[PDB]
Amino acid sequence: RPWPASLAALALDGKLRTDSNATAAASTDFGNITSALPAAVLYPSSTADLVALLSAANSTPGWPYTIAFRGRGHSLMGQAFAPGGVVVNMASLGDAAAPPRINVSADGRYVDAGGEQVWIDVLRASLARGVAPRSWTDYLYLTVGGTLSNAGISGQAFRHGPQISNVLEMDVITGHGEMVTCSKQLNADLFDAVLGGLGQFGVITRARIAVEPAPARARWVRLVYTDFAAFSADQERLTAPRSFGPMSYVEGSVFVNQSLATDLANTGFFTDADVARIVALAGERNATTVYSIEATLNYDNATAAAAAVDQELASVLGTLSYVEGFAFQRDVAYAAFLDRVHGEEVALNKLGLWRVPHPWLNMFVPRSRIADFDRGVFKGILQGTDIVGPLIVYPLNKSMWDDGMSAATPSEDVFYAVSLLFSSVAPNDLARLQEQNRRILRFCDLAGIQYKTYLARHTDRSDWVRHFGAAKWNRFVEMKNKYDPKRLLSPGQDIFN
Ligand SMILES: *[C]C1=C([C])[C]=C2N=[C@@]3(/C([C]/[C]=N/C4=C5N=[C][N]C5=N[C]=N4)=[C]/[C])C(=O)[N]C(=O)N=C3N([C][C]([O])[C]([O])[C]([O])[C]OP([O])(=O)OP([O])(=O)O[C][C]3O[C](N4[C]=NC5=C4N=[C]N=C5[N])[C]([O])[C]3[O])C2=[C]1
Ligand SMILES: *[C@@H]1O[C@H](CO)[C@@H](O[C@@H]2O[C@H](CO)[C@@H](O)[C@H](O)[C@H]2NC(C)=O)[C@H](O)[C@H]1NC(C)=O
Ligand SMILES: *[C@@H]1O[C@H](CO)[C@@H](O[C@@H]2O[C@H](CO)[C@@H](O)[C@H](O)[C@H]2NC(C)=O)[C@H](O)[C@H]1NC(C)=O
Ligand SMILES: *[C@@H]1O[C@H](CO)[C@@H](O[C@@H]2O[C@H](CO)[C@@H](O)[C@H](O)[C@H]2NC(C)=O)[C@H](O)[C@H]1NC(C)=O
Ligand SMILES: *[C@@H]1O[C@H](CO)[C@@H](O)[C@H](O)[C@H]1NC(C)=O
Numbered sequence: 067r068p069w070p071a072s073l074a075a076l077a078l079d080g081k082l083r084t085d086s087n088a089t090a091a092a093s094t095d096f097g098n099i100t101s102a103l104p105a106a107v108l109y110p111s112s113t114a115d116l117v118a119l120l121s122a123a124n125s126t127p128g129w130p131y132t133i134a135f136r137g138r139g140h141s142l143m144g145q146a147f148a149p150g151g152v153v154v155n156m157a158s159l160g161d162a163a164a165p166p167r168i169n170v171s172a173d174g175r176y177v178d179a180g181g182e183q184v185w186i187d188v189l190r191a192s193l194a195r196g197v198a199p200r201s202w203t204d205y206l207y208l209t210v211g212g213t214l215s216n217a218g219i220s221g222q223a224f225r226h227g228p229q230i231s232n233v234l235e236m237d238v239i240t241g242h243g244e245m246v247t248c249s250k251q252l253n254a255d256l257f258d259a260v261l262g263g264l265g266q267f268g269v270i271t272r273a274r275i276a277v278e279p280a281p282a283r284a285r286w287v288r289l290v291y292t293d294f295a296a297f298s299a300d301q302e303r304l305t306a307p308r309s310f311g312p313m314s315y316v317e318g319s320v321f322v323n324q325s326l327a328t329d330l331a332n333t334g335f336f337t338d339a340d341v342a343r344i345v346a347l348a349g350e351r352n353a354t355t356v357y358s359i360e361a362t363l364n365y366d367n368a369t370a371a372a373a374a375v376d377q378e379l380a381s382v383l384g385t386l387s388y389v390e391g392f393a394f395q396r397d398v399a400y401a402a403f404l405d406r407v408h409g410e411e412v413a414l415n416k417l418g419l420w421r422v423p424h425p426w427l428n429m430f431v432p433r434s435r436i437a438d439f440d441r442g443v444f445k446g447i448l449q450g451t452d453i454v455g456p457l458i459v460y461p462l463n464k465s466m467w468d469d470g471m472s473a474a475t476p477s478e479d480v481f482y483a484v485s486l487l488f489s490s491v492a493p494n495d496l497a498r499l500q501e502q503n504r505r506i507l508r509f510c511d512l513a514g515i516q517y518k519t520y521l522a523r524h525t526d527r528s529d530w531v532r533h534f535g536a537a538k539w540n541r542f543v544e545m546k547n548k549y550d551p552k553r554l555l556s557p558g559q560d561i562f563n
């Protein structure tokens with residue numbers, strides 16, 4: 067009942083809001099499928115405000131408010147909600163122009179970024195110093211603390227590992243309200259727990275991100291296949307350890323035949339002439355699906371850079387088996403490539419097709435069963451439907467993941483990131499997509515495929531235990547008991563709430 071002085075001070079300064087405008091904005095997310103109103107929203111102006119909130123919660127017998135840390139709210143199923151609790155509007159930590167919330171190291175070996183900062187700003191600040199993070203996410207308008215609480219993957223993860231494998235240290239305020247700086251050498255238990263920890267142990271206020279000298283441009287290429295075996299074999303060849311090959315980025319896409327021409331055109335990569343040739347190829351092979359590897363080779367402004375890239379690319383391509391003559395090239399500034407999805411957002415939003423339900427299906431599928439997944443899903447379940455949204459598929463190397471961290475991955479040395487990014491655009495098409503997702507998961511369970519979901523929150527304890535693995539689960543729980551004893555943090559994950 068009584069309020070600690072530092073907590074009341076937050077309300078007095080207008081940082082704790084309970085108005086419908088504040089609570090409503092913090093009640094929905096990108097998923098646009100689930101929603102939950104919090105009792106209040108906190109707009110912290112410094113990390114001290116966060117210490118005050120968490121300290122109050124930890125020292126107040128009977129504290130009944132769960133606490134969530136909202137970054138950009140790109141969660142899909144309410145992971146950033148605090149039902150009847152307090153949602154922290156993390157962005158507020160960056161309202162002040164000084165002191166800066168992003169500082170590139172004096173020696174240019176790393177960049178310190180506030181947990182609330184979005185990667186697009188981290189990128190700009192880094193480039194201003196001639197450097198840039200090594201591992202990214204496909205979309206840059208996500209927060210550092212947000213992607214780090216999951217894993218943070220993209221086409222560079224095969225060689226640099228996810229974003230959680232590229233963090234030197236962090237400042238974290240635990241459920242106890244204590245500010246702790248952690249790394250592999252200090253408070254490593256908290257360090258490993260928080261990375262991929264789904265916001266269960268504390269709030270990341272600062273993350274030290276590893277960087278590399280910034281490349282100036284990216285030779286961007288797409289290779290087309292009608293044969294999945296060749297497609298996957300080539301992705302594995304390009305991402306296999308040698309130390310890794312030349313490619314800086316490697317992803318893949320699945321195009322179902324029904325809407326082939328339209329989807330290829332909507333990639334913003336192919337010309338109408340390219341599209342016509344690919345459509346013709348599909349008909350010739352009588353394919354129900356077309357596959358495309360997407361890769362890049364980063365290079366700088368050196369006078370001989372462009373020519374070197376042409377030779378390097380020619381060599382790499384010579385080792386592949388895409389359909390003869392179906393290699394397509396583009397050349398753009400590094401930043402433009404990295405922020406490519408923002409353009410897709412702008413276009414979709416104008417059409418009112420961005421802010422719609424997103425029943426996205428994301429999972430890691432062991433290499434040994436990816437061909438079965440292709441048969442049962444791409445060539446099976448998905449056939450006959452009108453797909454809206456990209457179907458992304460690409461291999462990852464387990465060697466670049468730290469299994470000591472909270473993030474869960476399949477046991478195999480190589481596993482695929484499979485992201486079926488369905489957009490519910492048609493009238494009331496959501497129910498159909500949700501059922502289709504359950505069917506896909508059912509197919510995998512019955513086939514005995516040992517996949518791991520990503521960005522999904524389970525609603526049954528047995529599912530979370532299987533997710534992390536029993537032994538790893540006990541470790542997760544031990545860290546929960548040590549850092550969030552009252553089980554108040556990020557209740558939307560539905561692990562301890
Ligand atoms: C929305 C979204 C988008 C748009 C994107 C993305 N991305 C990603 C993926 C992929 C995708 N892709 C795509 C594409 N391509 C081409 N085209 C296209 N389109 C679309 N898309 C997924 C699937 C990438 O890339 N990668 C990854 O990995 N991921 C991603 N994503 C997802 C994310 O990451 C998530 O969402 C996260 O979460 C982040 O976000 P944010 O917003 O930042 O956050 P939130 O939601 O708010 O939250 C979450 C959680 O956590 C926690 N926290 C926060 N913060 C913090 C924390 N803790 C501690 N500390 C701190 N600081 C909370 O509480 C919760 O629980 C995507 C998406
Ligand atoms: C970035 O560097 C600045 C200094 O160059 C840091 O600024 C200090 O920030 C703390 C709280 O974050 C304040 O109490 C100090 O008054 C600030 N001092 C200065 C020099 O203004 C800032 O913390 C750093 N942030 C990052 C990205 O780690
Ligand atoms: C790939 O999809 C196209 C349509 O997107 C199919 O072509 C249609 O086929 C029906 C029945 O054969 C014809 O009546 C239509 O006139 C065709 N439309 C087009 C686009 O020309 C094609 O059959 C599909 N191919 C495969 C292998 O599934
Ligand atoms: C072109 O591809 C289509 C689709 O793979 C072939 O038609 C399939 O034929 C099998 C066996 O006859 C059926 O089980 C499928 O249902 C058919 N596809 C669908 C869903 O319509 C077709 O035979 C191929 N053309 C040839 C003979 O080369
Ligand atoms: C979904 O988004 C629409 C429009 O953006 C909004 O009217 C609706 O309240 C949202 N529903 C949920 C569950 O977020």
Ligand SMILES: *[C@@H]1O[C@H](CO)[C@@H](O)[C@H](O)[C@H]1NC(C)=O
Nearest residue numbers: 193196280281282283366367
């Ligand atoms: C690379 O060259 C472009 C155009 O000349 C320039 O804008 C950019 O700053 C250069 N990259 C570096 C070294 O910052």
